[PDB]
Amino acid sequence: IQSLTARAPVWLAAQDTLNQLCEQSGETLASSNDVTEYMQQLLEREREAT
């Protein structure tokens, strides 16, 4: 319980930022690799719009 309690607030802050970020986008993220692939799609849209 002490370990979990020490860990909790950081995880909660991270989750709030993540939810805000993915909700700001159209697609919902679920993993590190998923975030990376979304990076790549973002780059492609940059270089088309430009």
Which residues bind to other proteins, rule: CB under 8 A? 9, 12-13, 16, 19-20
We find the least distance from the C-beta atom of residue 13 to other proteins, in angstroms, to be 5
Supply the minimum distance, in Å, between the C-beta of residue 31 and other proteins.
23
Q: Which is nearer to other proteins, 9 or 26 (CB)?
A: 9
Q: What does the longest C-alpha to C-alpha distance in the chain come to?
A: 52
The nearer residue to other proteins, 13 or 42, going by C-beta atoms, is: 13
Contacts with 41 (C-beta within 8 Å, 6 or more apart), sequence order: none
Cα–Cα distance, 43 to 48 (Å, whole number) = 9
